[model samples]
Target chain A: KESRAKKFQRQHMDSSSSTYCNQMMRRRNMTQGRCKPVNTFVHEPLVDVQNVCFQEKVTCKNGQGNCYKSNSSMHITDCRLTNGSRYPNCAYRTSPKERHIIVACEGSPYVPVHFDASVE
Target chain B: KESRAKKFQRQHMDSSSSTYCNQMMRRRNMTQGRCKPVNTFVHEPLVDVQNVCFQEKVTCKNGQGNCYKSNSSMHITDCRLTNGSRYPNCAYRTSPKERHIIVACEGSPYVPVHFDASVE
Candidate 1:
């Protein structure tokens, strides 16, 4: 029972332009209650991200053992809320970075459930 | 509760060469214990496909509701298993198509769950 289009997909998954974060973050409702401090969008297919769960095992930010790291760098856009940003008026600065990422996986098929971090 | 990458995404979502079905179907295990008779691969992004769930409402092939039709045409590849194809040796003939599509959607956020049909 794989019911996709989860929060993970909404928070991440963008393959687009300069105002990418401002548009995507808002469109996906990441700026609803409060400006999300930080977020990342992977410009890769869902399958690639899902398959990353089968990559090298790693520790997640929360020390979860289900995290996996990608072996190759991928296109990613990092979104960071401006310091003085207020709720209902969210503003984000977008920064594109190509790097390997770590994500947490769960469920029977073991797909990525969380975008943990990106590294050198 | 969108867990994605189920039978839908596995059956659809291919942006590749002529041997696309032969490889993708096998890679996705669609050619497992039994040969899948027919399938389709949508050469479009998940977001675009997901957005189609909000398109024009329509009746599904099965007479059940929760189906939407795309306003614009899309790239698609239909795969039909070769007649003589046997288990563990699934062969498919790929035929490219461009047309408006219909899909069944479920759950919150309203995303495509099934590729129902395509029309002129």
Candidate 2:
């Protein structure tokens, strides 16, 4: 009671309709990660732009048993930075050590990488 | 008795050391999704870059109960494109329909969006 095409369709319906919308929808979710893939843009000549700038304090194992460390770095190639402002402006520091560092875009591509290991 | 500094260090130890490295490492993980954030670059002046291109076949409801759909799209703006060639060249088509579509970077920002709704 079913045509060959209909039988073929019923057998593989999951792979036929809504492919375009589905693709775009997927872009809305995870295209590599959080933001959509097409939404991200890369520099042509690659100008390192000072993207991330922040520091962390680490506790050293020496002295008053309370030693802190510092570190930082630059993020140059993501949509998080628009013009000269970094999105969120805050990096997630995950670890048992307090690190302090600073980063800026200032090299070829124009990005900067900075960090201080000195205890505070 | 623990010195205040020592206690302070212990209390905030996780906030000081390896902060820079930790940040970078974190970026290597889930900064947004799949890849590192800094690795992504947004086009300056925003060029419509045709990134993704593929297709899916869909099945109609009046057919043999087996509806196969088709779909496709372009992925620009991400690192997936390295100077004109789209990475993976394959988008994950997930759904119950076999969608058919074609995408190309064709306008400002230089990206393309294409899709076919007719069943195949």
Candidate 3:
């Protein structure tokens, strides 16, 4: 069985090219049985994703570094299942965006482990 | 504002007592604007949660250790918003379960970061 972290990387991490979602979704086994409606792929490096844990320690400031933000806006693709798409025929609409991704981090190694949401 | 990790802890970590959800949801600010539909609280020590990354490295076996599993089944509470519950009057049905939690670990500190799901 794949580790959760590895599974996450397989299913969610894709900093490669424009066809990230189409290839990744199928390669990751997400499109095996049915389509995944909403999913986000991080286009940053694994180290960058891991470093988010130590970025900012905010009190109440909006821009404070309570959560890690990419140094530069990252490339991400959001995969949404098409309305008329049905099971076994998973069709997705890929919308790529440049945004800051937020995630929750933990432990001494201090790496991001949870996907919170993406901001534009 | 709280870090994503802190928010996760506040909203999800509760090893204190049976009223975990009731107290945590309010204290963690999850019940302020609207009731959160479904949430899980981990009832274990922080260090234990952090150490899950070093536990296993499974390959393809079912019992293989790709992901870390708690030594003992941990107690958790699932909070579900009750039907017909209106805003400001958010009602919840708290169901408790004992299961092993699986989370993805990342970074050098190697800590459990994402709450994948609980297994019975």
Top candidate by DockQ: 1
What is the CAPRI rating of model 1's predicted complex? Answer: incorrect
RMSD of each: 16.6, 20.0, 18.7
| Model 3 quality (TM-score) | 0.37
lDDT of each: 0.70, 0.25, 0.57
Residues A16-112, model 3: lDDT tens digits: 3334456667765667777877677665446566666666532322543345555555545577777897877766765655566676666666766
Superposed model 2: Cα runs more than 4 Å off? A1-48, A55-111, A114-120, B1-55, B59-74, B77-120
Over B22-66, each residue of candidate 2 has an lDDT whose tens digit, in order, gives 233233332333323222211111122122222222333343222
By lDDT, the best candidate is 1
Candidate 1 lDDT at A8 equals: 21
Model 3 per-residue lDDT tens digits across residues B36-76? 77677665555565566666533322443346666556555
Question: Cα deviation of A114 in candidate 1 (Å)?
Answer: 49
Off by over 4 Å in 3: A1-19, A57-67, B1-120
Question: Which candidate's TM-score is highest?
Answer: 1
lDDT (10s digit) by residue, model 1, range A49-114? 778888899888888558889987866668888887888888787665557888777778777666
lDDT of 3 at A50: 62
Enumerate residue pairs that collide in model 1: A3-B2, A3-B3, A3-B4, A4-B2, A4-B3, A4-B4
